[PDB]
Symmetry: C2
Subunit: 533 residues, 2 copies
């Protein structure tokens, strides 16, 4: 079992108090999204715009802003239902561009979810309100997912005021209004939706939920990745009518090997598809259970490894007192459940309504796969145990350093501790993943509660925006400033962003000179023939 | 899920180095036993006697000594046995008094375990040798158990030089030589025996072993409390010839509740029967798995609940790929398996051989109970999670304080640290457990002269207000209270909340064991009220 690595460098508040924050009267940060050279930040009643080329002086000021508050009658209705007015606000929870000019923005609107269209360049409300049912949650403490694929919006949230109908929904475009089965613990059980990606012929979802492979034990939570077809048209007139015909979910296996594997089963966040040395990869942050000893880790799963688990066996529970087992291959119907029509094995079907009742009623009671998704190298890329907090947010620089052939990973924490890790992704690389720097990003004087929410890499401007429930802080990716001319300090920090120069000092690799001009040893860090400055 | 408490006070080295250490080429400590005011320390080749009435001046000086080095041919045969010369020594692994005059002593003898009888008064070889097979281990690095109950000795160890046949065994009596079924993975699978206790009509064993219920999952480790009957003599000629007809084992449940129970199932050490709040309980140290996040806890189980667990239903695996579930109460054969003959539900059967064969062949294929022994007061009595090390040894003072109504637990560690914890036992007591002091015990100057500082065992010298922390090469006498650390500062006194210390009108607070009336010592062990007390 690994041990907590020692941070090669630390950055306390006093070393980070010299950094600008955003407040804008609570911010109530909900999400953020970067397009080209502009970062939108969605909180309570407002959506701010920040020019990433505008380098701040006193404080990052919003270039523009979007105002949309709940009409007073909405607030009075939210009060009549019996919820406190602090929740009776229009917390912007959905902000997804449909094309290169308009954006779909959904807010909770005092527990009456609504949706509108705005223009990106001018933040102009051009149009009117689409209802927000099954697209924006009623509560701001919930998570939610919203994605656009070929014109159709795939959402994931709750659809009722009582917060009981957790659902994956799809609408808009030129298809049909599909959804999961209401109150069907076999399909999804008290989940917390996190992320979603569009790959191949499918759209994958990433969430966590109460596990049914542990129903004889406790209410343990597993990490699931679900999958649906883009061209899903629905079930036949008697089976799966107005429901999904390819909803397949599998388990993600973030574990430490040995004689008794240790599993990080709770998922806190994940990235999009990142090209990590030739192959597409998704990198997730997994902590342990609630009532457990807080430990966290960072696993990475490939997209071929995730497509294979769905090409595998299904999982069933024959008797109520038997262990969940794999369904034999000669007992699964035809065509191959989960395959999309007009593709591969189901190419003899042009619509999902022509699907037989043999296959559609099978996937209705066997939606869980048998295999679990293994990570690469079969061991996490980083872990953190001996501390009192859990890691949350995540972002990755796939190309770091002068030759941009190194991967860096930035993770959040429940206590505003953003960790920067040089990660090992290939056999021929390091010996272990090196925690380069540990930063205290929370700004008690500037902010206000110190749980990192999300991280946004600004690679071109060499920055990382760290989110909290009341502030966003711009932290430089590097800190070669503090090592200065102490050539040791810089080489012994092993930072790929920092490079030493003949001019007698060590600075960022994004300065202007050739890659060969910078000198460093991020691999080993050979301190030979040097002095303690 | 709670969190680690903060030490009210910490005793560092440069304070603890003002304490005497015992040293007796190393020592290779193995065990220690307290008889009245005498302590027997058993290590390699030798057995030391120290008088708990002799206040040390510079070093713990042993009074009497017993020597027992191995045979000349047992050094060089053990040389032929591949074993290193350091391993080829007579490590005393068993030292148990049979009566109040002589003692059974078993040693490894360079992987040729043998037993003898000595006299406590003289430590003289006043007997003749006995073979230590199934009684004393071949290897010193392993654990073992030995106990005398009703004339006979009940051992539990390994029996072969290759360390494969683990066995619970009985001898030194009028019957034959009973033992567990060798290689029966459903009876015993790779265990580490830790303790045994005679209670009622049974001898209960306490150990840990690879779980049979995690056959599908990983090689987990479950903590087992087993039990055998004392009047057992074996089965009939047909089934279980020269074997136990009452071997019943249950699982120990050290659990933090909630929507996802957190379990400590690796047993490290345990105590004997201690009367807590009126009922006999047993207190034990559990830790998480090896390949897990290091955490540890202190749980307490009442004997009544253990018996209620053993009077319950058995556990079976109906299908290879199914969950272990209970056996119906109509399918349990008569007489009640596990019950001792001449008692309760076997009052008619006068001997375990009069038993049938369906009952035996049932108890032969169902040695594992279904229920798990619940811990007292749901959540564990103590927890330690954020540290890099695991707890080990355990000792308990059940009558701390000037009124002797407080339970103070001392727990070892893998890094020479000892934790003193006033435990919350009954509801109408504390709010939660209070770890008063954290004592660094390992003495780098004396305890070594290689750096391994694993606490092995502890012994409570309540009659002399001490605690002999044991290591692999030293024993450190450690008082139960440094009431001198506070003295003048009433704030520091009531702030440590130690029941061993109390405040006096003389302006200095002291050990409550000084000879004055109980109503004279002022303290507040229920809250820690530093109100209206100046910061001295
Ligand atoms: C998790 O992955 C490891 C290696 O990738 C594998 O050995 C282990 O069996 C997996 N566990 C499960 C439950 O699939
Ligand atoms: C441990 O004991 C608690 C009650 O103290 C009980 O709820 C739990 O189920 C027990 N654990 C097992 C594995 O039976």
């Amino acid at each position: 079992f690994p041990e907590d690595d020692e941070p090669l460098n630390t950055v306390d508040y006093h070393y980070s108090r010299q950094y600008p924050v955003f407040r804008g009267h609570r911010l109530d940060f909900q999400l953020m999204l970067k397009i080209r050279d502009t970062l939108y930040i969605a909180g309570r009643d407002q959506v701010y715009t920040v020019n990433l080329n505008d380098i701040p002086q006193t404080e990052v000021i919003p270039s523009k802003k979007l105002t949309w508050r709940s009409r007073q009658q909405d607030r009075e209705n939210c009060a009549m239902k019996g919820k406190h007015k602090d929740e009776c606000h229009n917390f912007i929870k959905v902000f997804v561009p449909r094309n290169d000019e308009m954006v779909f923005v959904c807010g909770t609107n005092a527990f009456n979810p609504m949706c509108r269209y705005y223009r990106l360049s001018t933040l102009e409300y051009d149009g009117e309100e689409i209802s927000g049912l099954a697209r924006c949650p009623f509560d701001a403490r919930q998570t939610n997912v919203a994605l656009f694929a070929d014109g159709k919006l795939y959402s994931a949230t709750v659809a009722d005021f009582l917060a009981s109908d957790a659902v994956i929904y799809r609408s808009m475009g030129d298809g049909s209004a599909l959804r999961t089965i209401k109150y069907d613990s076999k399909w999804i059980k008290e989940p917390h939706f996190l992320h979603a990606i569009e790959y191949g012929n499918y759209v994958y979802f990433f969430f966590r939920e109460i596990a049914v492979e542990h129903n004889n034990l406790g209410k343990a939570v597993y990490s699931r990745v679900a999958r649906i077809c883009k061209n899903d048209m629905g079930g036949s007139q008697r089976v799966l009518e107005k429901h999904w015909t390819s909803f397949l979910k599998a388990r993600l296996n973030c574990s430490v090997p040995g004689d008794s594997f240790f599993y990080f089963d709770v998922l806190q966040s994940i990235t999009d598809i990142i090209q990590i040395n030739g192959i597409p990869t998704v990198i997730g942050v997994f902590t342990t259970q609630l009532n457990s000893i807080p430990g966290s880790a960072v696993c990475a799963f490939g997209m071929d490894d995730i497509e294979k688990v769905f090409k595998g066996r299904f999982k069933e529970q024959k008797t109520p007192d038997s262990v969940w087992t794999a369904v034999p291959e000669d007992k699964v119907p035809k065509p191959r459940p989960g395959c999309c029509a007009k593709h591969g094995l189901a190419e003899a079907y042009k619509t999902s309504i022509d699907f037989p009742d043999d296959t559609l009623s099978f996937i209705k009671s066997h939606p869980l796969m048998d295999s679990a998704v293994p990570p690469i190298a079969d061991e996490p890329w980083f872990t953190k145990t001996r501390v009192r907090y859990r890691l949350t947010a995540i972002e990755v620089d796939r190309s770091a350093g002068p030759y941009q052939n190194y991967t860096v990973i930035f993770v959040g924490s429940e206590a505003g501790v953003v960790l920067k890790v040089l990660a090992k992704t290939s056999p021929f690389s390091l010996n272990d993943s090196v925690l380069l720097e540990e930063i205290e990003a929370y700004n008690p004087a500037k902010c206000s509660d110190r749980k990192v929410v999300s991280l946004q890499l600004d690679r071109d401007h060499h920055a990382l925006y760290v989110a909290f429930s009341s502030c966003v802080v711009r932290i430089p990716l590097s800190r070669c400033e503090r090592y200065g001319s102490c050539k040791k300090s810089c080489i012994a920090s092993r930072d790929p962003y920092c490079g030493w120069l003949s001019q007698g000092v060590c600075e960022r690799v994004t300065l202007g000179m050739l890659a060969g001009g910078y000198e460093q040893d991020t691999e080993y860090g050979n301190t030979a023939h040097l002095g303690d400055c």
